[PDB]
Write a protein that binds this DNA or RNA. Structure first.
Ligand code: K
Ligand code: K
Ligand code: K
Ligand code: K
Ligand code: K
Ligand code: K
Ligand code: K
Ligand code: K
Ligand code: K
Ligand code: K
Ligand code: MG
Ligand code: MG
Ligand code: MG
Length: 1326
RNA sequence: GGAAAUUAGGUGCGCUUGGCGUUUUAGAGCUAGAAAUAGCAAGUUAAAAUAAGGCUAGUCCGUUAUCAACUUGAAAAAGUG
DNA sequence: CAATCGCAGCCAAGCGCACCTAATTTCC
DNA sequence: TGCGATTG
């Protein structure tokens, strides 16, 4: 007995099958364990393991971060209360107590129910005077009176608890006063530079236009509209856009040859502005300087809507402005509706269930839902004009705590906090002594490069401490070693050099690393002129001159530069041809030119004695992100540099790391020559060996020194790159193989054939930015979920224009258009947007075989470049559209694409093959060589997909889960037959160890040996005999006389081992919504002492697993003991306490005299068999899932495939006639579903509705009936019931919301393959 | 089948932050009526919680991965037809 | 009991490293 | 899709 294994690896399934050399699946008797009548059972060696999707760690990570921030937000308040503690005890010794118990009902409170003052008259008067906390905040900022210490605390705590963001660096000092004066100064600055065409201010209310509650682009339009003759994209318009915070492009303003984009917020602005001024001149400096001055006065116009001269709390005053205008408009809205719509007053102001004002304040109506409900009511009335204006600006009846408050920087809250401290420290000395302490509570942010402030019990932490003591926001710099922590942050993640594993890789922007990349590319450049017979390398003397002249003067070196400014102007070559570099060199000395601008000392950079210092500087600039820590690490070099360059050097920050170490490129030396790798790249006689040749040359010592420098199965797979969903199936695949090997008596298989299976928010954002750079108004002309349509998505990505013809596209005629593939689908199976365009007709592309024709590229390339700059097409999409001008698809390209259709190239699939190969092949030769006992073959899905369709082994996925197992069987058959027929293909499919046209036709007809007659692509008919053999062997590969019948017999076998992986449920305890209190006791307490009948709580806890309990419970008033057998759900929250002491946990639930040895742990999907073969799976402790599979005969599967594809060659008429000749199969398929449902589904109401729905459409076309019959299998599918539709009839799911019947059924414990079973008759228990 | 560089597009893991929401309580509802109710007034804010909790007591940890049964084992895992 | 209807925490910012695919140049 | 609530 020799055998092979077929495998189909998916995200939710692993199909498997064992075949013999006759392509047959064996059957075998397996022992059955347990206490039932059955001692053994026959099983076919074919099946599929099913499992729920494996999840990434992202959701767990976001919740872990949220917990840390709630812990730290609470500590900020605790820090503040500790500071107030001693003095607050003298004012009100129970104030903080009332704050902590504010949530408790009055019955549970220990102090008086009014938290602030402890009595009702004082509490009522507070809210009367300060209706919002911002009323109190502004008053404490602007008033000189001594304030109650309790009100001081509440205002400071409110700023510290909700402190604002940290997206702006440095200090913020808002100043509203000079918006008009600064705009006039920018106009005056602009007119002095363009006296010929000045701009008239002329009472243009710049303060109103720029500070208005509109978008930056909208206010830019309103300002430009007030200036006749000025365009929005003109020079003055871009300056206004710059002051607003946009990203204008000054390229067209100055007729530049490159983009000149500027935005003041990016740290690159100072360099970018200097780059622009270097081209246009320094007389434009005051132009952008005055633009920055105006930008500071309107920087906070979105959040600060009050003139800053009358208050030092403009944020709170802006909130007060919201409150007052809310009061004024509410009084006006109420008086209006009383007069004009008195009937709808109750619904608008009393009905919480409606989206009126009541639902806005008391119900669940959002601000957006409230505006939508009230807008038609406002338009019906008069006069609501100003209310309509405020509504469309989202400024009507506004609250103060709103979704859009995220734009408020922490410096704003800090300003008000600092002012309150300054006011009240004159009366409270402890506020003076603790002023900077309190401000530090608000401003201090744990650096992201420090991480959690742990002390040995965090697997996520890396921080180290200077001193062993508790870390506070005030001693953080002294207790935490920021330098070591910031270094460990990067050090724990960066690669080591694979060639020298003990050596870290160099920074990507290291000078020595960029020298390495330049010389490695330079050393393979050849040249030829009219005199020399054959091309020659560049000499070591030539490389140095080329580097010194071109690379050290220009950031990029073009091939034209090399030819013109070197070979001609220094070598006396009137002409020269260059090979090894195209257009321009890929490598460059970018860091060399960055430092040359900063330190201005070219001699210092070219002095190789300064090599170690420059590598240390770049290492510091790469390792650290805090520019103060950077400045501290550059102190040892403060004598070579003045203070001006040091200020520029500490701003030059780098990111990224290279692939090689400094010891590899310029450290280790060849023993004979004493030269490093970089030395050989600089000069290597006339051989000019590059990096790959040097470390592989057996005549040098680099190769042996690198060779001299050179995990469980679960950890290895987890550490692989790829989706954690496919990685779950990879581990299960290995476990299936291990079991299948032991099933075959631990004999290894001959072959293992593996095959691995192959939004709306991003689409909208990608189009809005694209048309913005495009300048088009197509989004405004014809305005998310609609972009799920493929054609409409391509329509907007192409600005409503044809990609092949340069003509407009009618958006209401998208059905008349064609979605054509850039690279034809016959070569590349790319269904993504990167390979699709929208055109009037696919004939506009040109020929069908190749890339769009030359005439199309010459006419449309300009249009494609604009779409590329607007990020509407990727660089890959632009490259393959313009490929015709580069010659188009070569004959080797077409063959390469057709080999890619057969040979799997994904790295993740190669890892699976390597894992199986290394686990199977472990013995060695007499010469210490690996003995490959098992060939691991990798196939792509198209090979079996085409095999199914050629020979009518059709697949209908909705019928059952057998298709996963059948795919694995077909993988083994096709894979082993292909390797047996053509052993030379083992180099392409087996892991380990003219001509273009031939390889194209060879790879195109590689599967023809299965057929008897072949109609070729050339049109010529070929014939093959019945039995196929191997060339040199003569062994029989395929017998078309009985091997197809073998496949038909295998695929028609009803007994297939479908196994749903039982799994303990993990994750959140329950649903997260905090529901209001209800007398129903389903609610779960949110804290230990928060009775949900008083405080509300959670619903629907998740059961981790169920347990079978055989015990007694107390019944009735007398508490009689009554023997019971029950299924108890152990929730995720309860799991730890249950497992710590099961008996104590069960006794606490009310069970007595528990049979401890009869407790069975029953995770989700636990399998039970009842009567007549009916099976049920545990959905939980209180619901069951369907446990049976409907094995529909093969003749019905093939009929359902052809009849449903009836609308979609000359032989298609034979398949169409088969459908009409077997229209009676519809009744027979319904009968199969009915008998199956009556036997195992037991949903008579839904079956009657199904049969009634089938009879109503018996005159419908056979295609439509077959399509809807496929929907009916949802009724019979394995797993959780789900709704489905037969034509227009909807059949809602019939759930099995009772688990009592399984308590006396047969529990089935299945191995991973389902071949080994332990069956427990639970009726004997109890 | 690999390596480096360049260009472009993605994925994973980890850290540090912001704003909402929701829950209970506080923000004296008034007049009439025996009451059911009716007519008005009012509404924008805050505290506290945001997995129960844990010991290791940290400004730490608490939702990923992994899991038939039986025997062994803390676990990982091994053995069993 | 069943048949039936209802419900589910979300939005945003910054940073670091490591992978992957897919084109080009030079090589093993 | 597991379960809470409502209706029949
Ligand atoms: K009380
Ligand atoms: K204008
Ligand atoms: K609301
Ligand atoms: K609400
Ligand atoms: K709120
Ligand atoms: K190039
Ligand atoms: K850095
Ligand atoms: K899990
Ligand atoms: K899960
Ligand atoms: K199992
Ligand atoms: Mg907590
Ligand atoms: Mg809130
Ligand atoms: Mg937050």
């Amino acid at each position: 007995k020799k055998y092979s294994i077929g495998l189909a690896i998916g995200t939710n399934s692993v199909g498997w099958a064992v075949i013999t050399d006759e392509y047959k699946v064996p059957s075998k008797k397996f022992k059955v364990l347990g206490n039932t009548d059955r001692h053994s059972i026959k099983k076919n060696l074919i099946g599929a393991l099913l499992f729920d999707s494996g999840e990434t760690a992202e959701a767990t990570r976001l919740k872990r971060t949220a917990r840390r921030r709630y812990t730290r937000r609470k500590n900020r308040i605790l820090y503040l209360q500790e500071i107030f503690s001693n003095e607050m005890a003298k004012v009100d010794d129970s104030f903080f107590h009332r704050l902590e118990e504010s949530f408790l009902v009055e019955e549970d409170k220990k102090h008086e129910r009014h938290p602030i003052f402890g009595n009702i008259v004082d509490e009522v008067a507070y809210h009367e005077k300060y209706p919002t906390i911002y009323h109190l905040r502004k008053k404490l900022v602007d008033s000189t009176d001594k304030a109650d210490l309790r009100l001081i605390y509440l205002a400071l705590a409110h700023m510290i608890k909700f402190r604002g963001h940290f997206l702006i660096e440095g200090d913020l000092n808002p100043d509203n006063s000079d918006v008009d004066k600064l705009f006039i100064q920018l106009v005056q600055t602009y007119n002095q530079l363009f006296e010929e065409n000045p701009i008239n201010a002329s009472g243009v209310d710049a303060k109103a236009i720029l500070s208005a509650r509109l978008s930056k682009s909208r206010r830019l339009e309103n300002l430009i509209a007030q200036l006749p003759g000025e365009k929005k994209n003109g020079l003055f318009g871009n300056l206004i856009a710059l002051s607003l915070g946009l990203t204008p492009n000054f390229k067209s303003n100055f007729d530049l040859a490159e983009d000149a984009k500027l935005q003041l917020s990016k740290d690159t602005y100072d360099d970018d502005l200097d780059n622009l001024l270097a081209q246009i001149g320094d007389q434009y400096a005051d132009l952008f300087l005055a633009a920055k001055n105006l930008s500071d006065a309107i920087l906070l116009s979105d959040i600060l809507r009050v003139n800053t001269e009358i208050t030092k709390a403009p944020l709170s005053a802006s909130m007060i402005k919201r409150y007052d205008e809310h009061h004024q408009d509410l009084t006006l809205l109420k008086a209006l509706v009383r007069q004009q719509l008195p009937e709808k007053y109750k619904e608008i102001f009393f009905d919480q269930s409606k989206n009126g004002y009541a639902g806005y304040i008391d119900g669940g109506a959002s601000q957006e839902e409230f505006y939508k409900f009230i807008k038609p009511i406002l338009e019906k009335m008069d006069g609501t004009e100003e209310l309509l204006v405020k509504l469309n600006r989202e400024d009507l009846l506004r609250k103060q705590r709103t979704f859009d408050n995220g734009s408020i920087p922490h410096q704003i809250h800090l300003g008000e906090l600092h002012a309150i401290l300054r006011r009240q420290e004159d009366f409270y000395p402890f506020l003076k002594d603790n002023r900077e302490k309190i401000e530090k509570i608000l401003t201090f942010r744990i650096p992201y490069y420090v991480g959690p402030l742990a002390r040995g019990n965090s697997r996520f932490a890396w921080m180290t401490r200077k001193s062993e003591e508790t870390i506070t926001p005030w001693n953080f710099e002294e207790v935490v070693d920021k330098g070591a922590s910031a270094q460990s942050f990067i050090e724990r993640m960066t690669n080591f050099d694979k060639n020298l594993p003990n050596e870290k890789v160099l920074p990507k922007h290291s000078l020595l690393y960029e020298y390495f990349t330049v010389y490695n590319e330079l050393t393979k450049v050849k040249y030829v002129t009219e005199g020399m017979r054959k091309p020659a390398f560049l000499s070591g003397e030539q490389k140095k001159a080329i580097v010194d002249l071109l690379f050290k003067t220009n950031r990029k070196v073009t091939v034209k530069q090399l030819k013109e400014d070197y070979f001609k102007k220094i070598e006396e070559f009137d002409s020269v041809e260059i090979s090894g570099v195209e257009d321009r060199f890929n490598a460059s000395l970018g860091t060399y030119h960055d430092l040359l601008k900063i330190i201005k000392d070219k001699d210092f950079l070219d002095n190789e004695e300064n090599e170690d210092i420059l590598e240390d500087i770049v290492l510091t600039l790469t390792l650290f992100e805090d520019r103060e820590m950077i400045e501290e690490r550059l102190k040892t070099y403060a004598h070579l540099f003045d203070d001006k360059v040091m200020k520029q050097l500490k701003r030059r920050r780098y990111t990224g790391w290279g692939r090689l170490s400094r010891k590899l490129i310029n450290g280790i030396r060849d023993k004979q020559s004493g030269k490093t790798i970089l030395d050989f790249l600089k000069s290597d006689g006339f051989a000019n060996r590059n990096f790959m040749q040097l470390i592989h040359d057996d005549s040098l010592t680099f190769k042996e020194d690198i060779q001299k420098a050179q995990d469980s199965l679960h950890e290895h797979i987890a550490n692989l790159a790829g989706s954690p969903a496919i990685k779950k199936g990879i581990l299960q695949t290995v476990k299936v193989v291990d079991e299948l090997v032991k099933v075959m008596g631990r004999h290894k298989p001959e072959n293992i054939v593996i095959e691995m299976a192959r939004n709306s928010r991003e689409r909208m954002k990608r189009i809005e930015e694209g048309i913005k750079e495009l300048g088009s108004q197509i989004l405004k002309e014809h305005p998310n979920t609609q972009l799920q349509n493929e054609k409409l998505y391509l329509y907007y990505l192409q600005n409503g224009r044809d990609m092949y013809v340069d003509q407009e596209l009618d958006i209401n005629r998208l059905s008349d258009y064609d979605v054509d593939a850039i690279v034809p689908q016959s070569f590349l199976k790319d269904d993504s947007i990167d390979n699709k365009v929208l055109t009037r007709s696919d004939k506009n592309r040109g020929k069908s075989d190749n890339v769009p024709s030359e005439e199309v590229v010459k006419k449309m390339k300009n249009y494609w470049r604009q779409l590329l700059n607007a990020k509407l097409i990727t660089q890959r999409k632009f490259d393959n559209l313009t490929k015709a001008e580069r010659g188009g698809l070569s004959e080797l390209d077409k063959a390469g694409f057709i080999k890619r259709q057969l040979v799997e190239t994904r790295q993740i699939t190669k890892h699976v093959a390597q894992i199986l190969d290394s686990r199977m092949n472990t013995k060695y030769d007499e010469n210490d060589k690996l003995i490959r006992e098992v060939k691991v073959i990798t196939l792509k899905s198209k090979l079996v997909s085409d095999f199914r369709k050629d020979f009518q082994f059709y697949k209908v996925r909705e019928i059952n889960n057998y298709h996963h197992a059948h795919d694995a069987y077909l993988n083994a058959v096709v894979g082993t037959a292909l390797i047996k027929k053509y052993p030379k293909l083992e180099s392409e499919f087996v892991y380990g160890d003219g001509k273009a046209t031939a390889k194209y036709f060879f790879y195109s007809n590689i599967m023809n040996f299965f057929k008897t007659e072949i109609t070729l692509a050339n049109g010529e008919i070929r014939k093959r005999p019945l039995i196929e053999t191997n060339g040199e062997t003569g062994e029989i590969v395929w017998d078309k006389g009985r091997d197809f019948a073998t496949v038909r017999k295998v695929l028609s076998m009803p007994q297939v081992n479908i196994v749903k992986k039982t799994e303990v449920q993990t994750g959140g305890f329950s649903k997260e919504s905090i529901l209001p209190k209800r007398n129903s006791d389903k609610l779960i307490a949110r804290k230990k002492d928060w009775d949900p009948k008083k405080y509300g709580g959670f619903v629907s806890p998740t059961v981790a697993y169920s347990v079978l309990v055989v015990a007694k419970v107390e019944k009735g008033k007398s508490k009689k003991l009554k023997s019971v057998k029950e299924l108890l759900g152990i929730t995720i929250m309860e799991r730890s306490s249950f497992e710590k002491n099961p008996i104590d946990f069960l006794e606490a639930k009310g069970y007595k005299e528990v049979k401890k040895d009869l407790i069975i742990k029953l995770p989700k999907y636990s399998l039970f068999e009842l009567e007549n073969g009916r099976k049920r799976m545990l959905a939980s402790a209180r619901e069951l899932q369907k446990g049976n599979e409907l094995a529909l005969p093969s003749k019905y599967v093939n009929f359902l495939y052809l009849a449903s594809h009836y609308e979609k060659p000359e032989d298609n008429e034979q398949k169409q006639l088969f459908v009409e000749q077997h229209k009676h199969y519809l009744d027979e398929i319904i009968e199969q579903i009915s008998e199956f449902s009556k036997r195992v589904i037991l949903a008579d109401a839904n079956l009657d509705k199904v049969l009634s729905a089938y009879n109503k459409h018996r005159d419908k076309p056979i295609r439509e009936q077959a399509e809807n019959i496929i929907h009916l299998f949802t009724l019979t599918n394995l797993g959780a019931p789900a709704a489905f539709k037969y034509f227009d009839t909807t059949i809602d799911r019939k759930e099995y919301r009772s688990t009592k019947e399984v308590l006396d059924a047969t529990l089935i414990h299945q191995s991973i393959t389902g071949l080994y079973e332990t069956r427990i008759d639970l009726s004997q228990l109890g």
